[PDB]
From a paper:
The IALB_1185 protein, which is encoded in the gene cluster for endo-β-1,2-glucanase homologs in the genome of Ignavibacterium album, is a glycoside hydrolase family (GH) 35 protein. Here, we showed using recombinant IALB_1185 that this protein has glycosyltransferase activity toward β-1,2-glucooligosaccharides, and that the kinetic parameters for β-1,2-glucooligosaccharides are not within the ranges for general GH enzymes. Kinetic analysis further revealed that the enzyme has wide aglycone specificity regardless of the anomer, and that the β-1,2-linked glucose dimer sophorose is an appropriate donor. We propose that IALB_1185 be redefined β-1,2-glucooligosaccharide:d-glucoside β-d-glucosyltransferase as a systematic name and β-1,2-glucosyltransferase as an accepted name.
In order to understand the binding modes of ligands, the complex structures of WT with glucose (Glc) and Sop2 and the complex of the E343G mutant with 1-deoxynojirimycin (DNJ) were determined. c The E343G mutant was used for the complex with DNJ. The electron densities of DNJ molecules were observed only in subunit A in the E343G mutant. The DNJ molecules are located at subsites −1 and +1 like Sop2 in the WT-Sop2 complex. In contrast, the position of the other DNJ molecule shifts to a little below from the corresponding distorted Glc moiety (3H2 conformation, φ = 322.034°, θ = 125.390°, Q = 0.532, according to the Cremer–Pople parameter calculator) of the WT-Sop2 complex at subsite −1. The absence of the side chain of the residue in the E343G mutant enables accommodation of the DNJ molecule without distortion (4C1 conformation, φ = 145.774°, θ = 4.556°, Q = 0.579).
Numbering used by the authors:
A (entry chain B): 6 to 691, 700 to 716
B (entry chain A): 6 to 691, 699 to 716
The structure:
Amino acid sequence: SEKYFVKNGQPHFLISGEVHYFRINPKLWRNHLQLLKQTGADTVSTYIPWDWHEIEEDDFDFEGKTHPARNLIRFIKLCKEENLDLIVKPGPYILAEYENQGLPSWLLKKLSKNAFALDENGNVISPDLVSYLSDEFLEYTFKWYDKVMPIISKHQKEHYGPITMMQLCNEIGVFQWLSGKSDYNPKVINLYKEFIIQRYKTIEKLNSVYSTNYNSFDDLKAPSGKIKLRSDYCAYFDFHLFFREYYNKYISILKNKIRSFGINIKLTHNIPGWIYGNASELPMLISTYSEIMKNHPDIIFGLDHIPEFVSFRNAHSDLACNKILEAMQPEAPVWAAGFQAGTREHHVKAYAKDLETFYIASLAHGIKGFNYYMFSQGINPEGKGFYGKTFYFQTALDAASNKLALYDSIKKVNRFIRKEQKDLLRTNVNSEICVGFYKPYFFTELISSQLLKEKKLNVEELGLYIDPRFLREEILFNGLLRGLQTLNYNYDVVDLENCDLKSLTAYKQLWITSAEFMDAETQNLLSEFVLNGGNLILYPAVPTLDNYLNRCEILKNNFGIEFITKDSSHKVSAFGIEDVFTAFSKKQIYNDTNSKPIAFTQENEICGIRKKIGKGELTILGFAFGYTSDEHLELIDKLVKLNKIKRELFVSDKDIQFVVRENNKSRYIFFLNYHNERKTFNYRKSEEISIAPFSYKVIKENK
Amino acid sequence: SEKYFVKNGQPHFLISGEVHYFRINPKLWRNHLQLLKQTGADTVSTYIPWDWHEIEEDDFDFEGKTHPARNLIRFIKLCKEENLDLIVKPGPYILAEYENQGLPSWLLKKLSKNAFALDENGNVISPDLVSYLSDEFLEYTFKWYDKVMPIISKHQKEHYGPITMMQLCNEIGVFQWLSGKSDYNPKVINLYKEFIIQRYKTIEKLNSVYSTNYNSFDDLKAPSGKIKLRSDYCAYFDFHLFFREYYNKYISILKNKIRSFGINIKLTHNIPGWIYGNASELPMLISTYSEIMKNHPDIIFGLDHIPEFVSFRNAHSDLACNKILEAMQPEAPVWAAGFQAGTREHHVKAYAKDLETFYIASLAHGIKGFNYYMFSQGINPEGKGFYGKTFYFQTALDAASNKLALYDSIKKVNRFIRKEQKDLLRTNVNSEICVGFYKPYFFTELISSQLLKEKKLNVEELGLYIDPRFLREEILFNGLLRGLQTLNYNYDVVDLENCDLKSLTAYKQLWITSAEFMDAETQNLLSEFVLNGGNLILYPAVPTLDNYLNRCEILKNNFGIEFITKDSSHKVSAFGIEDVFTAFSKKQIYNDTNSKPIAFTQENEICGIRKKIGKGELTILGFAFGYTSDEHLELIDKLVKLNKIKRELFVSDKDIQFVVRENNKSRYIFFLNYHNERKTFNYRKSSEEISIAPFSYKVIKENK
Ligand SMILES: OC[C@H]1NC[C@H](O)[C@@H](O)[C@@H]1O
Ligand SMILES: OC[C@H]1NC[C@H](O)[C@@H](O)[C@@H]1O
Ligand SMILES: [Ca+2]
Ligand SMILES: [Ca+2]
């Protein structure tokens, strides 16, 4: 049932350390590799920077002819000699605070204006930022691949060499995330038009969806600036779908070119999204890769986990991310390609004693492998560093291979993992709760994000009151998911797109955080789920619109729901819990025919009901609660207990988090103390223990 | 020397605890007051909520006639019986996680639209957000004061009651700030117009400053939407000056009303600005009080410190805020009207072990008094909680008066303070470094802030590149101030407005973080500072504009500086430090003339020089750095060492923070470990061994 890496036909915990050969004194390459191996790590990970090896146009150095740290061949030979597998990341983009993000200076100087990402006024966005499908950019990328890929091919695992995985580029679309700005290159806008024409066939079909009045596709302009009309919302929605297809076209081009050298190893890509030690935006980045993930079984996405600290302030970020990736990529292990080791930023401390707790929490939260980023600090050679001489701080090893405090923490965690991995990797949590992932609420990197200062999406201007980013961040991520983890209730996430009914029927409850819009397919899926005997929890809105904000009331009509939207005090009562804070004065007030009222406004109007539909049960709440009070945890607890779901343990201290992972034979209880307080507690199944601040205890049980 | 509170002409550390009588069973009021007093607290603090006591329009209960917890009179008499002084805070706003921020439900339903703060389109920003000088709002506020102020007056200290201080309203502008919109109410528009006419006298004069072509004052309106022209920037700048006079007018109206009741006690106000456990926007909000603090010597402002956690992530916020309050209120003690105790919200934990370290760091950082907020948890009666039934968590006492973990932390801190307050309050740190506080860089709450929904200020549109908010947040607050604290160099902050030359000459170094604009008066003061023998460190720009972005080259000409602004790599070399990352491509490029070049671009162009001018020294860096790399701390350290400024102690672990506070008689060494690491280090005065737990402190007293 579990997905995990395999070595020597056994469950293998992938333990990789990022070591940038091009940022380390080559005299000390062997020493770094031996210290990495001595932690019990099995793999080493590195970029192969285009700029570093194509030193001038068509002048390649992979042998240290011009600088000993250009000796990639020797670095590969050292990995083999020190029995480390190798992950290679040849770009073309590598990011990683390398000048020009790893693209050669000589390339950027000589490319035409046409090869750059362009703003809506035809201006160069950044002297760094190419257009991914620029003819010129891809021609030079191919010429780089023509030299680096035969080296990778020779040393790939399917030729019994050390190279087990290769990353394609780095964080495709990251610059559209960081800026909130799309590439308006005429070549991209032409691919957008083909996408639109392909999707709608005729201008009449598009007009009826968008409510536009184009005489042809020639009158259709790429969306830009603020959404003022529903037609603008429609155009931006399809512009977001277009970019997911665009990224799939870019990564497919690179992949086919890589496969042409007989490279048959696993390909990777990695997902950023952590901001100031929380990851509530990372699901938006996962959503940018939806079309790659449906079209490429053979590309494994991993997570760049950057918690910065380990406390109740971010305890919930890593589980939610792991759970959502698992929903989007169920056939591949969940693994952290960028697993924080040290800090990218000197002024943002990474404490060994924090990260050690995060490493063990990551095991409780289902991680199957990771790549310590950065295991080894780096020194940028000769003006190659974007931001300073030094690359990362408080790592396992400094750039000179000095052991730092994190080294002993990684050795301790790695020893536990190696000891347990055969049982641990085959354990799962028993989840009787499923939480829906509705991808369209996440498709807003160009109009609404924590990185966009100026919002282009203001739902009030469209006659709506539930913002999909507020819903997915405060009601879902920081709300329900945070609530369930705090209450020590196991949950799974499911991708609602082309979701199989049978895969929902395993759960005692499905929870859906709904805005006022939801496509017919999902409305239909949830209708069938309940009618066939599923228990559905839905809030804060029964949807009445589809993704284009055209009328779609399938779920409402199938469930016999009638409501009016009315203003009331922010607080409601729900299941006899008084003073439940809700986010909106506007609430759905339900007709209660054939329904049990279970929630009331201050004026005693009915803003939540329970009813039987077919063989199933429906709980709808016409109001938005996250987790900003103890009443919110009481409400989540009452809802879970409607279907008599139980925690795996009774723990005396409610502020101790636990995860029970088991298979037929083995049980692991992970206790996690996210608080600055020594806690003593006892536990028993549904026996006294002390945990230091910001710390952990793992207890094993043979069943 | 030091500002501190006194009682019987002795240094007294003000120790208050916040106890909301309205949120506690009145049968337990005495038990809360006794337990507060047993910690060594001398004072109890509370809101008197308008909504709680005017139960319906013109129906008042201060005696517990309709609800026992409405017996304000009995609470006042218990404070007297239990020998606590009382701070009262009757609003009209209290915030306090109370429904409608403490304003009565019946008021907000009764008020016409023009009582409310309105956006640019004339719509109500928020149903509990009033326009402060609304005739209707002040009418009902006055009727509330008519009933509560006679009780307060009767129970003052001078009439043998316990009431020693009263807060006027609550964090003026906080509600407007949190809404992310500014107030365009027609009262604001009309008062702005009168302000502009008073300021310019003739349309010709305003046109000469703004570069506009108005025919009359009737053509001009309060600026709205985004700044596109320098004339728009000018209009917003005067709009910021106007809002400072407007907040002065609000608190003047409340103050004159209160005085009319024979209330002679000390009046207070409280400063907002912490959010998510940092305070980089607090200086902006304190700047909105500039006209109050110039006009009201007798109103003592205190800080509302909400750290939430205590780590290197926020170590610098409390010190910078204390220093900035001192710069703006130099004749009163620095004190915390709100001194975090527990958490206002369940999902944001407050640990006794964090907060105990914060209390000790606050002593190190020069705090002279505080009010633990909340000392006592409360339960909201009658659905009065904004966010839920329970008011605060992880406090010193639960609502029932049980001691929680924090109680023992507060007892330990207060015992230290009462044992030492006679010396400690008279101690100073030895600051050889002064940092300039240039208030106009902070005047952006209408156009640019972390909370403001619209970005109205893009300096690039005005042909500028140094954004004043980026400068004050990243180069000053999170940059220089953070760097100096991390490096264990003492600094003072001085308000440059009307600043006395005499008060700058005490320092070895004056540091100015400058944008491209600075008024003639400040340009002249820094000129005279250096000519008379001051040592000036100025970056990232020689300013050449005044506050209206018109030409002002006083400083540039007085310092004999020639520069061109050019693009280069972000990276510079400075003082032999390579790969110093700077925030802007554009840098100032200086001539060689009569100067030592000490910083260079990737093209080896001169972007920093040192020179002797008159009796003084000038270091100018034509580039912006905060603290986002190890190179930045190395650069700050190099600049401090230019004038041989030394740390008080050699400490073997650079990540240990210390403060040495001393007077003639006593030395206190504070060690602060802001890191999740047990640290064993040695130290000596410029060797003793110390082990310090994570997120912990040591205090050593020496008799000299
Ligand atoms: O938000 C916490 C606390 N900050 C300070 C405010 O004045 C007070 O009303 C509030 O309860
Ligand atoms: O956290 C934001 C804001 N909340 C309200 C508090 O009273 C204020 O002091 C604080 O700055
Ligand atoms: Ca799982
Ligand atoms: Ca019905």
